[PDB]
Write a protein that binds this ligand. Structure first.
Ligand SMILES: [Mg+2]
Ligand SMILES: [Mg+2]
Ligand SMILES: [Mg+2]
Ligand SMILES: [Mg+2]
Ligand SMILES: [Mg+2]
Ligand SMILES: [Mg+2]
Ligand SMILES: [Mg+2]
Ligand SMILES: [Mg+2]
Ligand SMILES: [Mg+2]
Ligand SMILES: [Mg+2]
Ligand SMILES: [Mg+2]
Ligand SMILES: [Mg+2]
Ligand SMILES: [Mg+2]
Ligand SMILES: [Mg+2]
Ligand SMILES: [Mg+2]
Ligand SMILES: [Mg+2]
Ligand SMILES: [Mg+2]
Ligand SMILES: [Mg+2]
Ligand SMILES: [Mg+2]
Ligand SMILES: [Mg+2]
Ligand SMILES: [Mg+2]
Ligand SMILES: [Mg+2]
Ligand SMILES: [Mg+2]
Ligand SMILES: [Mg+2]
Ligand SMILES: [Mg+2]
Ligand SMILES: [Mg+2]
Ligand SMILES: [Mg+2]
Ligand SMILES: [Mg+2]
Ligand SMILES: [Mg+2]
Ligand SMILES: [Mg+2]
Ligand SMILES: [Mg+2]
Ligand SMILES: [Mg+2]
Ligand SMILES: [Mg+2]
Ligand SMILES: [Mg+2]
Ligand SMILES: [Mg+2]
Ligand SMILES: [Mg+2]
Ligand SMILES: [Mg+2]
Ligand SMILES: [Mg+2]
Ligand SMILES: [Mg+2]
Ligand SMILES: [Mg+2]
Ligand SMILES: [Mg+2]
Ligand SMILES: [Mg+2]
Ligand SMILES: [Mg+2]
Ligand SMILES: [Mg+2]
Ligand SMILES: [Mg+2]
Ligand SMILES: [Mg+2]
Ligand SMILES: [Mg+2]
Ligand SMILES: [Mg+2]
Ligand SMILES: [Mg+2]
Ligand SMILES: [Mg+2]
Ligand SMILES: [Mg+2]
Ligand SMILES: [Mg+2]
Ligand SMILES: [Mg+2]
Ligand SMILES: [Mg+2]
Ligand SMILES: [Mg+2]
Ligand SMILES: [Mg+2]
Ligand SMILES: [Mg+2]
Ligand SMILES: [Mg+2]
Ligand SMILES: [Mg+2]
Ligand SMILES: [Mg+2]
Ligand SMILES: [Mg+2]
Ligand SMILES: [Mg+2]
Ligand SMILES: [Mg+2]
Ligand SMILES: [Mg+2]
Ligand SMILES: [Mg+2]
Ligand SMILES: [Mg+2]
Lengths: 80, 121, 82, 157, 205, 129
RNA sequence: CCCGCAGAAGAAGCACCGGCUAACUCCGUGCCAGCAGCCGCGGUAAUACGGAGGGUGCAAGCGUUAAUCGGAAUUACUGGGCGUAAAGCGCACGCAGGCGGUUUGUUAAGUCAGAUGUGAAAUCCCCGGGCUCAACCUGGGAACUGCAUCUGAUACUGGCAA
RNA sequence: UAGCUAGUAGGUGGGGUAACGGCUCACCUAGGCGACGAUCCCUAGCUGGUCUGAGAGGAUGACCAGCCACACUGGAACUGA
């Protein structure tokens, strides 16, 4: 299948582009404790489809600006 | 302690300073020498200890101990310096290498002659 | 251009040649794709002297890789029916 | 079954109106070389009088140690005062790789090969009690089988 | 490379007979053995735990004629090899050519066996060998070459080997100076006096 | 405030053994019963119940062989401040394999000895010497 | 590399020696001259200083030096502490953050299990082999505790349920 | 060192590039980054490995091998795959 990544939106106030955080629950190399680490990506989308505070699926694709190589696939669970 | 505290601020290793700032991990270093003189040590000893201020090549100004009975150092005369505290003269933390350069060997030594820079009899 | 050639390993006056598939531009000892047997000129008549994996040679020479002066003769030395 | 030996001898002072009077303390550990150990302290005015006084206490103050062939059963701690003491079973090769005081007690006990390290303070008296605490503590598979009332093979295998 | 000093001085310090000054006569009684290491031989040594290890190490060194740097290398090899570390230390020492040449009887002393190896006399599997440290593998045939065979130093030295215990692991022809090293030596076969355990203690710390 | 319930269970056992106490009541749970069963099945605890409908109180009954207690020592490994998940080959063996390590694996809670043979790893809950 | 020449012939130091740490005495000197890695040695009977012998330890190297790790559980994840030894903020409230009682259902992020990829070759590690032997050299093996990728296991932890 | 950033962050019109794209214009939107440490400051080639350690680690990056960078200093483009 296509190698997508789930993630919650941080902001969408840029016209046809969305910044999305990807929470990843990796463990600490030394101390062994599980940390909640973040990965803020820039992502493309046609129109202002997705708002602030909602889960989104994202695909790796062609680099369509300075940053912002990732692109939207679909929305799952809209904003509250 | 507390595994979360350590994630937030890890264990800082104690960066222990070097005893001998001769710099760049150097075995020995040349010195032009100024003021050769006699100094008294700390409490239980009592003596007239032979010592000289060493103007090192890199820029430092230190005191080095003149180990052995008698010496040829005076006013100037270029000498070589090795690491090693005397543990009596407070301040002095280097040793002159006897034999090398203008610093000659000790006169009439037999036992232990690499220390104190003397050839075979 | 990929080429099958010796690598020259081992001590002074005691060479040992790792026949190897490498690029033309890269060095003798340096980069390669995969080593393919060896050669020892100071072996003499004993158990082992020279070994050369002929199956991997078909993958490279069949495609488009040259064989050097020394390695071409070791294919003659190992023979097809002798 | 003697296998007695001395760990440490240490002179100690009292202080009285006249001046100071010195005595000596011994520290001897004895064992049969087959699962009995016993430290004895003892103290006397003269040095050789102390070691006899120590050895006599050591013989009486003996502890049994259930050990496998010529080694320990399982890795074992044994704290006492300021000495931590850890020691591991180890295999049929090797020897007693442990510190002095901690290895006098081990060799006369009859353990032929173990790993061992004295953490904390390494006071010869307290490390010897630290080991013997750990060796007394050390339970065998026959003890553990009977304690739970299951089976010697079902636990082990 | 070698000791080349007073050799029977080494036996008095160590106490026991080291087979350094063994030679033609059987027993010496010619040094005040045991009670005269040096000027201060009557001084009873207190002798610590590090002492007894180092006295044991130097004894095994001075018997076999090996130096600390080479002797340490045997320990490193011994630790990596299978079995027991102590048994391998001495099994490697006994496999030396100058030691096997001594055990065959081609040399009254081990220094004579070392020199006889070094002097192009000793030959094994049809190949001449000069190295005293040569590790003699199982199933071999050490021998003397035809030029140096039946010279005056070897014939007198072979008659000494009849008084000796004679190892079970190796065999000697005696007529044509031809030896045969068969198996590796076992602990129980040789010595029964020099302790290995204490020499394993010295190098593990 | 009562963050780890499982560690609290293992203290009531350890402290109950120290007092030479016969029984040990506590608030029950799914995982409490799973662990307490694994302890019973090998033979540290001698029987247990889960008496109650609305507010269930799981009580254990601690074993004693001599004057000494049966549980020599017992400690939480995978506490909530630091979870410890071990792989099949990397599973521990407590006391060189004569004490057990309770380990929550994907086919229910079980001993480390059972987890090796079953062919899977998991969250190591406690060591029981 | 293989044979012939001669004749022990051309070929041994240098640390150390009060304890730690394998190894003793005589002189000279007298808190002076000097040793000192740590403790510490000398004030007229120095085992520590200088000399000598005597020893001990290494030896084609030996000491000193600088440099890293070790011992140091003396930054402690494995593996330390905080009443009096260094160390509980003067005491509260509290957002972010860390952690969270108990019971079913569902996802599988964590976790676990297998899957294929791949971790360049070298060294490092075993079974071998060629240097007269080793050192070196080299053939194969595992190792390369990797990181990704589909498939499941759902106890535990998280997500979402009521 | 706690705030930094105006081709700065996007979108399109044009433009270039072997090719994706503020790589470069013209406009349009006024954002983007940062306590999961931006910015600034000091130091530094990176890795396979090496060294030490029981191992975790700590140190390290001479020698062989891969990658990057640089060529009297600072620019610039040409010629060609
Ligand atoms: Mg994935
Ligand atoms: Mg993972
Ligand atoms: Mg770009
Ligand atoms: Mg002296
Ligand atoms: Mg040829
Ligand atoms: Mg030919
Ligand atoms: Mg060509
Ligand atoms: Mg008095
Ligand atoms: Mg301490
Ligand atoms: Mg040598
Ligand atoms: Mg002594
Ligand atoms: Mg052989
Ligand atoms: Mg002749
Ligand atoms: Mg070691
Ligand atoms: Mg697994
Ligand atoms: Mg002739
Ligand atoms: Mg001749
Ligand atoms: Mg001393
Ligand atoms: Mg003493
Ligand atoms: Mg001594
Ligand atoms: Mg006299
Ligand atoms: Mg000295
Ligand atoms: Mg006298
Ligand atoms: Mg005197
Ligand atoms: Mg001498
Ligand atoms: Mg040396
Ligand atoms: Mg140093
Ligand atoms: Mg350290
Ligand atoms: Mg440490
Ligand atoms: Mg800790
Ligand atoms: Mg502390
Ligand atoms: Mg105070
Ligand atoms: Mg305080
Ligand atoms: Mg308070
Ligand atoms: Mg108050
Ligand atoms: Mg919160
Ligand atoms: Mg819960
Ligand atoms: Mg459920
Ligand atoms: Mg359903
Ligand atoms: Mg499912
Ligand atoms: Mg695979
Ligand atoms: Mg494959
Ligand atoms: Mg592979
Ligand atoms: Mg190496
Ligand atoms: Mg090599
Ligand atoms: Mg080999
Ligand atoms: Mg040769
Ligand atoms: Mg290979
Ligand atoms: Mg290889
Ligand atoms: Mg291969
Ligand atoms: Mg295979
Ligand atoms: Mg293979
Ligand atoms: Mg590799
Ligand atoms: Mg599915
Ligand atoms: Mg279900
Ligand atoms: Mg939460
Ligand atoms: Mg939530
Ligand atoms: Mg505006
Ligand atoms: Mg190591
Ligand atoms: Mg360590
Ligand atoms: Mg290593
Ligand atoms: Mg270079
Ligand atoms: Mg590379
Ligand atoms: Mg240049
Ligand atoms: Mg140029
Ligand atoms: Mg230029």
């Amino acid at each position: 299948k296509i190698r997508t990544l789930q993630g919650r939106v941080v902001s969408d106030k840029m016209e046809k582009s969305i910044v999305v955080a990807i929470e990843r629950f990796v463990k600490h190399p030394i101390y062994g404790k599980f940390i909640k680490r973040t990965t803020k990506l820039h992502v493309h989308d046609e129109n202002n489809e997705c708002g602030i505070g909602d889960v989104v699926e994202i695909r790796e694709c062609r680099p369509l600006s300075k940053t912002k190589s990732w692109t939207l696939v679909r929305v799952v669970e809209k904003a509250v | 302690a507390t595994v979360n505290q350590l994630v937030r601020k890890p264990r800082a290793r104690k960066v222990a300073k070097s005893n001998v700032p001769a710099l760049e991990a150097c075995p020995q270093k040349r010195g032009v020498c100024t003021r050769v003189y006699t100094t008294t040590p700390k409490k239980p000893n009592s003596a007239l200890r032979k010592v000289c201020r060493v103007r090192l090549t890199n820029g430092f100004e230190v005191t080095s101990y003149i180990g052995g009975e008698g010496h040829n150092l005076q006013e100037h005369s270029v000498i070589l310096i090795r690491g090693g505290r005397v543990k009596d003269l407070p301040g002095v933390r280097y040793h002159t290498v006897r034999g090398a350069l203008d610093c000659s060997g000790v006169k009439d030594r037999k036992q232990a002659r690499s220390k104190y820079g003397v050839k075979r009899p | 251009m990929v080429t099958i050639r010796l690598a020259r390993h081992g001590a002074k006056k005691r060479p040992f040649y790792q026949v190897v598939v490498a690029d033309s531009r890269n060095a003798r000892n340096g980069r390669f794709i995969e080593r393919v047997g060896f050669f020892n000129p100071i072996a003499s008549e004993k158990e082992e002297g020279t070994r050369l994996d002929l199956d991997r040679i078909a993958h490279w020479v069949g495609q488009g890789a040259t064989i050097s002066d020394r390695v071409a003769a070791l294919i003659k030395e190992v023979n097809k029916a002798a | 079954e003697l296998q007695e030996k001395l760990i440490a001898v240490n002179r100690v002072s009292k202080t009285v109106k006249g001046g100071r009077i010195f005595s000596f303390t011994a520290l001897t550990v004895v064992g049969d070389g087959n699962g009995r150990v016993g430290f004895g302290y003892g103290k006397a005015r003269e040095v050789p009088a102390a070691i006899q006084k120590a050895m006599e206490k050591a013989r009486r103050n003996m502890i049994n140690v259930a050990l496998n062939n010529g080694t320990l059963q399982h890795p074992v701690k044994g704290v006492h005062t300021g000495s931590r003491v850890f020691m591991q079973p180890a295999s049929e090769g090797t020897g007693i790789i442990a510190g002095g005081a901690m290895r006098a007690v081990l060799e006369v006990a009859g353990v032929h090969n173990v790993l061992a390290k004295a953490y904390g303070s390494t006071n010869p008296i307290n490390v010897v009690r630290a080991t013997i605490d750990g060796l007394e503590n050390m339970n065998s598979p026959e003890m553990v089988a009977a304690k739970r009332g299951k089976s010697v093979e079902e636990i082990l295998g | 490379a070698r000791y080349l000093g007073p050799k029977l001085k080494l036996s008095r310090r160590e106490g026991t007979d080291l087979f350094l000054k063994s030679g033609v006569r059987a027993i010496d009684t010619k040094c005040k053995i045991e009670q005269a290491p040096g000027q201060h031989g009557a001084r009873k040594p207190r002798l610590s735990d590090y002492g007894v290890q180092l006295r044991e190490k130097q004894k095994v060194r001075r018997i076999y004629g090996v130096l600390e740097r080479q002797f340490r290398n045997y320990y490193k090899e011994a630790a990596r090899l299978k079995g027991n570390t102590g048994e391998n230390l001495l099994a490697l020492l006994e496999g030396r050519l100058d030691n096997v040449v001594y055990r065959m009887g081609f040399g009254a002393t081990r220094a004579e066996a070392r020199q006889l190896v070094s002097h192009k006399a000793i030959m094994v599997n049809g190949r001449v060998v000069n190295i005293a440290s040569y590790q003699v593998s199982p199933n071999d045939v050490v021998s003397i070459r035809e030029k140096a065979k039946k010279q005056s130093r070897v014939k007198a030295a072979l008659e000494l080997a009849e008084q000796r215990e004679k190892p079970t692991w190796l065999e000697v022809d005696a007529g044509k100076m031809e030896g045969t090293f068969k198996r590796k030596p076992e602990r129980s076969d040789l010595s029964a006096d020099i302790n290995e355990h204490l020499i394993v203690e010295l190098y593990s710390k | 405030s009562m963050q780890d319930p499982i560690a609290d269970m293992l203290t009531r056992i350890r402290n109950g053994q120290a007092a030479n106490k016969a029984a040990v009541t506590m608030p029950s749970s799914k995982l409490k019963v799973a662990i307490a069963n694994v302890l019973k099945e090998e033979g540290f605890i001698e029987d247990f119940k889960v008496e109650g409908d609305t507010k269930p109180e799981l009580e254990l009954t601690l074993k004693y062989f001599q004057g000494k207690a049966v549980v020599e020592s017992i400690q939480r490994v995978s506490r909530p401040g630091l979870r410890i998940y071990k792989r099949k080959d990397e599973l521990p063996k407590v006391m060189a394999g004569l004490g057990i390590a309770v380990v929550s694996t994907s086919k229910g809670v079980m001993t480390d000895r059972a987890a090796r043979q079953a062919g899977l790893g998991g969250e190591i809950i406690c060591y029981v010497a």
